Amino acid sequence: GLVPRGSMGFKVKLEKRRNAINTCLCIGLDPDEKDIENFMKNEKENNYNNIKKNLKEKYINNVSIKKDILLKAPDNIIREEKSEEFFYFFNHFCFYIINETNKYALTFKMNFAFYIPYGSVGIDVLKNVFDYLYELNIPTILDMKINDIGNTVKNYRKFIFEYLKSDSCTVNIYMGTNMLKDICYDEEKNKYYSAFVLVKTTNPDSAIFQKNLSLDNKQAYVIMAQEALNMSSYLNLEQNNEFIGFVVGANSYDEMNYIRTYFPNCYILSPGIGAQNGDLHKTLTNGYHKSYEKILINIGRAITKNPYPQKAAQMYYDQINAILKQNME
Amino acid sequence: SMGFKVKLEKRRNAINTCLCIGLDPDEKDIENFMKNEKENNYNNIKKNLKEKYINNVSIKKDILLKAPDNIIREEKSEEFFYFFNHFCFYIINETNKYALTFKMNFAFYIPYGSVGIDVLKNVFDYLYELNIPTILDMKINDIGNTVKNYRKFIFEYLKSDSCTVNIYMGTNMLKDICYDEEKNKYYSAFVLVKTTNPDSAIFQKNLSLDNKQAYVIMAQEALNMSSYLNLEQNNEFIGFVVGANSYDEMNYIRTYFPNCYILSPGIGAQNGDLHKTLTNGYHKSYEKILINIGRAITKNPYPQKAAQMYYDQINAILKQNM
Ligand SMILES: *c1cc(=O)[nH]c(=O)n1[C@@H]1O[C@H](COP(=O)(O)O)[C@@H](O)[C@H]1O
Ligand SMILES: *c1cc(=O)[nH]c(=O)n1[C@@H]1O[C@H](COP(=O)(O)O)[C@@H](O)[C@H]1O
């Protein structure tokens, strides 16, 4: 009755991890330029103690890109490999955050926009980040909020699900729900994949379209949720241990309550705690499911911009679990 | 320096068209170019290597300048990079004289990992040296702090003139895409209004507010943001993506937003009707109606002739409209 890692659908992988670790913390890894620079400065000042720790981990030997560089001595990089210095410290920052926080994480979410602004270099880092997480067997989301016509979105499907080997991604279906057939399904290989569609977002004017637009007396966010679920049904995702879930922001308490009430077994991804000031008690109570992999609480900057990310992650893990315990009593 | 609004007007005066050429190479296009080049003594690569502005690309120029016979023997790990970049250069060299603008969809450049992002960079470098206005098609959407990374990639790293944006998440994202407060810089974007996909009516038409369909609400909110940001005073604008196949919407948008910039994909591969699209979306400053053609040019085995014919027919239709 045993399945090897990589050989099961996201639904099963998430359920096993939640059973093991007893949380719904999703740790966001969105490293900005200041983060990377700060890491390099701190490492330079302390003889690279965190990099030396990364270098001890076995799975670092199993990453795809420029392992020759990543495994070098840090002082060798700086003196002899100056054109690789940014690559090195960028990739070592992510490995550091992952090494420090992974024991608390149901899943990691990496937002693509943080890995693209330097050109090809960050995309090598991103690939290595997905390879590393694959080796540790931690569930992954690529947050890229993709949208386009079907012929074009197949390319993202290939990047996200074949090249990165991500378990899931985020998608904006405003263009049309039919794009999902080219994202959550590969007709050539007969493979199924999971995604979270945008339902209610955390930006301060999210209401302008998601709530102001309606059809009869349902607001756009409700219609969009229903359409996404209808597509999941058509594609038979849940039969292949995959799903289409919902992004619902951690500050949209009324919408969270509605979505959970009206779609009782939906998978919800909820960003907005920490940096965006969302209310964790309210969000987690309104989105609660007894299978709490169905209510992922994403925390990015509040962990990654803390000088002690392991302790910041532990604190959120403990705070989530305390609220989970109340909901379970 | 000058501003996209001024860039477009001035290129329009020089070349007299509103053709926007879509550069979206898929794996099979790249493989076919490599197969054909081999069989025809690399005649197109050798033509590429004759061009002036190849000596100005940012990334691995050394490699791109090598003879293809030598790449395949001594730089084999660079073979895909080499042929991908040369395919893009070949299309640009063959078609640029007909193009008001080039639009590169990001999705085609990402799925092999970093290698295609180096190609994309060199593509934008090459177009920049040719002073051709550019659009990065990425249909971006996120919260403000995140989308700033896209502003940097698109407008600082690629030095693109504009991009496509989906504002369904909210309109305030545009303050961190089209404006850089720190640097006092302003940039142009086209927002999705009516898309070409078959089921585009589901949210864009069947949702409404007041007695206006969603697509109208969206266009108006985008123009309000343009005003807020003072883009037009900085020679930049927020324009609209309106499907070539959406004649009523095009009609509505041109009538009710008389001086708006429209980018219209969906002719060729997606079957739209050039004559109706151009008539319905027409403006005498025809840079305000960009007709995008990607696959109908790039998947044509005679891409120079294909661009020429769209140019010619666009011009005959523009002449008819006066
Ligand atoms: C996406 C959608 C949304 O509605 N809100 C969001 O914040 N996001 C993305 O989630 C992440 C939040 O991280 P942080 O505020 O905890 O740092 C970030 O990737 C954003 O793009
Ligand atoms: C974006 C939005 C839209 O509504 N329709 C679209 O087709 N697109 C993009 O535009 C290009 C169309 O190219 P082609 O059909 O002429 O090849 C493509 O980049 C698609 O992503």
Q: Dump the DSSP string for A76-113.
A: HHHHH-GGGHHHHHHHHHHHHHHHHHGGG-SEEEEEGG
| Gap from B320 CA to chain A (nearest CA, Å) | 32
Catalytic, out of A16, A66, A145, A191: A145
Distance CA A20, CA B197 (A): 43
Contact assignment for A198 to B169 by CB distance below 8 Å: yes
| Gap from B78 CA to chain A (nearest CA, Å) | 14
| Gap from B305 CA to chain A (nearest CA, Å) | 25
Contact residues, A window 301-320, toward B, CB-based 8 Å cutoff: none
Contact residues, B window 12-71, toward A, CB-based 8 Å cutoff: 24, 26, 59
Residues in chain B: 322
Name beta bridge partners: B30. Answer: none
Quick one: which of B229, B174, B168 has its CA closest to B200? B168
In order of A36, A94, A98, A272, the CA distances from A41 in angstroms are 9, 15, 19, 29
Residue type, A47: N
Contact B110, A156 (CB under 8 A): yes
Quick one: which of B51, B81, B88 has its CA closest to B64? B81
Atom 12 (ligand 2): residue with closest C-alpha? Answer: B265
Residue A328 in tokens: 């379970």
Strands (E), A225-288: 244-248, 268-270
Contact A23, A106 (CB under 8 A): yes
Q: Which of B111, B145, B207 sits opposite A158 (nearest CB)?
A: B111
Contact A190, A162 (CB under 8 A): no
Q: Count the neighbouring beta carbons within 10 Å of the beta carbon of residue A107.
A: 26
Residue type, B316: A
Query: Is A158 touching B (CB cutoff 8 A)?
Result: yes
Q: For residue B301, with 0-12 CB atoms within 10 Å meaning exposed, 13-18 middle and 19 or more buried, which class applies?
A: exposed
Q: How far is CA B3 from the centre of its chain?
A: 16
Distance CA B159, CA B155 (A): 5
Question: Is A74's C-beta closer than 6 angstroms to any atom of ligand 1?
Answer: no
Q: Give distance in angstroms: CA of A272 to centre of ligand 1.
A: 6
Residue A274 in tokens: 């920490």
Atom 19 (ligand 1): residue with closest C-alpha? Answer: A111
Give the ligand with the smallest distance to the CA of A150.
Answer: 2
Distance CA B143, CA A134 (A): 28
B141: which chain A residues are within 8 Å (Cβ-Cβ)?
Answer: 145, 147, 172
Contact B186, B236 (CB under 8 A): yes
Q: Give distance in angstroms: CA of B213 to centre of ligand 2.
A: 22
Name beta bridge partners: B20. Answer: B101, B292
Question: Is B293's C-beta closer than 6 angstroms to any atom of ligand 2?
Answer: yes
Strands (E), B141-274: 162-165, 179-180, 185-186, 188-194, 208-209, 212-213, 238-242, 262-264
Topology of the domain comprising B1-322: TIM Barrel (3.20.20)
Angle in degrees, CA B131, B137, B142, rounded to 5: 125
Question: Is A305's C-beta closer than 6 angstroms to any atom of ligand 1?
Answer: no
Distance CA A273, CA A295 (A): 13
Query: Which atom of ligand 2 is closest in space to residue B196's alpha carbon?
Result: 4
Q: What's the DSSP call for residue A4?
A: P
Q: How far is CA B103 from the centre of its chain?
A: 2
| Gap from B143 CA to chain A (nearest CA, Å) | 6
B113: which chain A residues are within 8 Å (Cβ-Cβ)?
Answer: 65, 123-124, 127, 159, 163
Give the DSSP letter string of A235-258: HTTGGGT--EEEEE-TT-HHHHHH
Q: Give distance in angstroms: CA of B143 to centre of ligand 1.
A: 7
- The resolution of the experimental structure, rounded to one decimal in Å, is 2.0
Strands (E), chain B: 19-23, 101-105, 134-140, 162-165, 179-180, 185-186, 188-194, 208-209, 212-213, 238-242, 262-264, 289-293
Highest CATH level, class, for A1-329? alpha beta
B299: which chain A residues are within 8 Å (Cβ-Cβ)?
Answer: none
Name beta bridge partners: A21. Answer: none
Contact B68, B45 (CB under 8 A): yes
Distance CA A166, CA A156 (A): 11
Query: Is A251 touching B (CB cutoff 8 A)?
Result: no
Query: Is B214 touching A (CB cutoff 8 A)?
Result: yes
Is B26 marked as a binding-site residue? no
Quick one: which of A163, A230, A236, A227 has its CA closest to A194? A236
Distance CA B25, CA B108 (A): 6
Contact A115, B152 (CB under 8 A): no
